């Protein structure tokens, strides 16, 4: 209802850096809110693309931001009659960023890795890696759970089981309230996809520079499968956490598998041991059902509801014609030992090729009426195709079909305005939660403030 579209703030990164590809609010020990922005095509210090991360302090006038510094030097280690190698060129540092407590986790899903042993190798592949930073102390740590030291031939002899070479760890990411980092790795197990989880504290305490292959004893990875429904499913393209089984002592995970079962797509709700609690199947092949997932209670009953996005959904129209517009599916959580059912609401985009449901952000209670609200992005929506973000307010009955407010892109064509989104944090301390929108195509982030 009330985000100010006139009084925006713009934060800018370097040309061609994709500043705004990912973002999050980060709060320091004192309590001051800043904005973490990922910029996965930022040039490194040797003019080669490595990606980068920026920490922006809140200013009404916005502007440039300091670079949260990370080690962009490749590493080599000759140990145990092998040669371990990291490759940070084109790694896409900041393709995902997430904040937890006083920690920032920025990931490079296309960081490559190889192990040489005489004339053999593991193969130079994108295992992915996450860089962890603690701004107020300077501490750095890394996490790269898919790195192995198994040679190519052995995978072949074992029919490519437990093949983590193409994980792209940190493609998606989320952190629980307790401090468990959960990474989506959609290239895991020969492109089925997997999840890796580990406590943030343990990542820091087990990491030393130059080791490259090390143990995080408390880590837990998901499982490989011979079920063809999972092949090429990109399970972990998106990830999120919530409470979906009544037991508050446990945390449930929501995983996006947008090409699951021959491109039908799926989202799964899992316990923290990775046992399936529920599966939500996509509606239409190639719709990318599971591109986005969002967890928030919108109907005010204290039970987390689930939102799933299928940005390439094609709507039926006059004379048997289909029209790619995108769709978002709302699933309200019922009471008792009852699973998620059919959707309570379908929100369909209106602009052709708009990719409505490309991103879904919980906003918190934007107008303080009691019900939490969400924002949905159509990165190429609006009459002009410049991009659009639509606010839907919560009510007793779920969400409204009619958006309360539409935010048109202030940037030019190709900005991908809305491709990334974050809310539910009051950046200016006025008592109302605000919204940050990324437009990686324009190398900028826009901050919208909520008002009485």
């Amino acid at each position: 209802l009330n985000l100010d579209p006139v009084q925006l703030t713009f934060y800018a990164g370097p040309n061609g850096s994709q500043f705004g590809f990912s973002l999050d609010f980060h709060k320091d020990s004192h309590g001051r809110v800043a904005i973490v922005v990922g910029a996965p095509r930022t040039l490194g210090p040797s003019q080669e693309e490595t990606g980068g991360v920026f920490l922006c302090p809140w200013r009404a006038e916005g502007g440039q931001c300091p670079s949260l510094l990370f080690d962009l030097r490749d590493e080599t280690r000759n140990v145990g009659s092998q040669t371990l190698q990291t490759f940070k060129a084109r790694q896409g540092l900041g393709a995902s960023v997430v904040s937890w407590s006083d920690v920032i986790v920025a990931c490079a899903p296309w960081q490559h890795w190889n192990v040489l042993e005489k004339t053999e190798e593991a193969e130079k592949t994108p295992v992915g890696s996450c860089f962890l930073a603690q701004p107020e102390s300077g501490r750095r740590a890394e996490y790269s759970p898919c790195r192995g030291n198994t040679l190519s031939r052995i995978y072949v002899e074992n029919d490519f089981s437990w093949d983590k070479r193409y994980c792209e760890a940190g493609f998606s990411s989320v952190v629980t309230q307790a401090g468990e980092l959960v990474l989506g790795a959609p290239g895991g197990y020969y492109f089925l996809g997997l999840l890796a989880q580990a406590p943030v504290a343990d990542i820091f305490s087990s990491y030393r520079p130059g080791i490259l292959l090390w143990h995080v004893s408390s880590q837990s990875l998901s499982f490989d499968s011979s079920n063809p429904e999972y092949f090429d499913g990109y399970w972990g393209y998106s990830v999120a956490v919530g409470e979906f089984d009544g037991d508050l002592n446990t945390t449930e995970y929501v995983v996006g598998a947008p090409t699951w079962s021959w491109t039908l797509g799926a989202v799964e709700i899992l316990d923290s041991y990775y046992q399936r609690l529920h599966r939500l199947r996509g509606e239409q092949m190639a719709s990318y059902f599971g591109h986005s997932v969002a967890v928030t209670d919108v109907n005010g009953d204290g039970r987390h509801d689930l939102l799933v996005g299928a940005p390439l959904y094609m709507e039926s129209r006059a004379d048997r014609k289909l029209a790619e517009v995108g769709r978002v599916y709302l699933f309200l959580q019922p009471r008792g030992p009852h699973a998620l059912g059919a959707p309570s609401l379908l929100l369909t985009g209106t602009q052709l090729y708009g990719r409505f449901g490309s991103a879904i952000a919980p906003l918190g209670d934007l107008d303080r009426d009691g019900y939490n609200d969400i924002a949905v992005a159509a990165p190429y929506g609006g009459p002009s195709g410049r991009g659009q973000v639509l606010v839907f307010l919560g009510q007793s009955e779920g969400l409204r079909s009619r958006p309360s407010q539409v935010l048109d892109s202030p940037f030019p064509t190709g900005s991908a305005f809305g491709f990334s989104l974050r809310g539910a944090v009051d950046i200016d301390d006025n008592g109302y939660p605000d919204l940050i929108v990324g437009a990686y195509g324009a190398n900028q982030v826009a901050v919208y403030r909520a008002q009485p």
């Epitope: 280690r77 000759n78 140990v79 145990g80 009659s81 030291n149 087990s206 990491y207 030393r208 130059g210 080791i211 292959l213 090390w214 143990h215 004893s217």
Partner: antibody
Framework: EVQLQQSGAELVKPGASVKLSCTAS????????VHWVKQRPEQGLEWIGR????????KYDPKFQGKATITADTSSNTAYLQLSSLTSEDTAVYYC????????????WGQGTSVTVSS | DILMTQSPSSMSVSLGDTVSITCHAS??????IGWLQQKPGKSFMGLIY???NLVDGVPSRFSGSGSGADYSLTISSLDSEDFADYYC?????????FGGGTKLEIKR
């Protein structure tokens, strides 16, 4: 608390075999490489080999190829070392070892199993 | 195989001394070295991994240094419990190989 609990002292006859065990306590044996090391008063420490219990794959110093067979069982969380054709040179103390963090390191050690070959 | 030559084989030192044990590899092992302690009649405890990193719980008075083929373990301000045997191990190549050991002994 990580702790490797080795089996008790062995008194065995030359030409026979013996099988020592190392049971993981406070962790799972499949978590890391497990190594076996021989110690003798005069000749010092010798590395025998290692196993990756996750998959069973092994490596050995050529000196012990054919005498030593390392195995592991993730059901019982135990690693094993078997020595065939016992000689007087096999009279030694044997340790199982594993790393703390570094895949390749040798940081945590069992209490040692003593083997005496005698007629 | 890589030959790890450890020196000295023994030293007679006193409480509060700072002492160093050195270890020379037969080739470069680029910090792929561990230091181990064995107290009288006891088993082993890991002190250092990858050249300089203290194993969890190990006192700060132990420290590792060196590079290439030459490394040192330094104990600062010897405690009574530090009178033990110490060994280096390399894991740059298989087979892993150990130094011959250094024994700390009480001077009198």
């Amino acid at each position: 608390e990580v702790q490797l609990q080795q089996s008790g002292a062995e008194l065995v006859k030359p030409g026979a075999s013996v099988k020592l065990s190392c049971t993981a306590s406070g962790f799972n044996i499949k978590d890391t490489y497990v190594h076996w090391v021989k110690q003798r008063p005069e000749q010092g420490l010798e590395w025998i080999g290692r196993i990756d219990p996750a998959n069973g794959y092994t490596k050995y110093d050529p000196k012990f190829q054919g005498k030593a067979t390392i195995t592991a069982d993730t059901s019982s969380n135990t690693a094993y070392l078997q020595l065939s054709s016992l000689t007087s040179e096999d009279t030694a103390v044997y340790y199982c070892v594993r790393p703390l963090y570094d895949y390749y390191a040798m940081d945590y050690w069992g209490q040692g199993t003593s083997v005496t070959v005698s007629s | 195989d890589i030959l790890m030559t450890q020196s000295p084989s023994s030293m007679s030192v006193s409480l509060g001394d700072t002492v160093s044990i050195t270890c020379h590899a037969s080739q470069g092992i680029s910090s792929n070295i561990g230091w181990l302690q064995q107290k009288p009649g006891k088993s082993f405890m890991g002190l250092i991994y990858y050249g300089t990193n203290l194993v969890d719980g190990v006192p700060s008075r132990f420290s590792g240094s060196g590079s290439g083929a030459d490394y040192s373990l330094t104990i600062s301000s010897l405690d009574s419990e530090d009178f033990a045997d110490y060994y280096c191990v390399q894991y740059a190549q298989l087979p892993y190989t150990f130094g011959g050991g250094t024994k700390l002994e009480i001077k009198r």
